[PDB]
């Protein structure tokens, strides 16, 4: 998995 913003990437 997740970004620094906690999005799945």
């Amino acid at each position: 998995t997740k970004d620094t913003n906690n999005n799945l990437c």
Partner: antibody
Amino acid sequence: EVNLQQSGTVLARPGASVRMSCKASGYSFTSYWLHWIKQRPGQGLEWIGGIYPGNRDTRYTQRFKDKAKLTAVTSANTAYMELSSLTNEDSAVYYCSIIYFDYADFIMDYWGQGTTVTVSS
Amino acid sequence: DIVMTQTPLSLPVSLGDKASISCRSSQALVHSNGNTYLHWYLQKPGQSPKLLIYKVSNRFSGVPDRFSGSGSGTDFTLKISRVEAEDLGVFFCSQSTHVPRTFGGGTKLEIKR
């Protein structure tokens, strides 16, 4: 569930440094990034950086690159932010924040009460 | 820093009326995972921001239906179908699909009586 407790008001002297905390509960402290944001009396909101307690990996913006230091003691679900060489611009309120939107049955977006810092002599 | 521009900056309204806040970003907010992480917050004086709508059109738990969200790519709108007296404060649109996560300057909603 899920709340963030931030340390209380802090009075600091110019050139000095302050260490403030944010204790979390309600979610897996070691599986999401935790953010810190600054807000001046008049101004809007600005993101300082974040930390991934799981592996202590951090992230900052060029501005706070040498102004802020982030750490976290996972055995206590607590995070820390340290501001060095204080000035009048450092005087503001700081919030730790958690957001997460990829699981519908568990949407997160919470803020500590914020920690108001006053830099004065 | 993908810039967020809100307009208007001040919003005079009378109870019952409808209101609209426009939010625009310097770059697309469509993340590679496919979602668009544009959100709207409301901050009463003396408190931390409170989420109203996440991912452009999703109302957060406990937020009145009077609030709606629309937008695509770079152009986004927050709508207050009916303005009560609680809606007092400053509204912020925000982006979290890019790093750093940014906020708009905000729109202070003023009531006319």
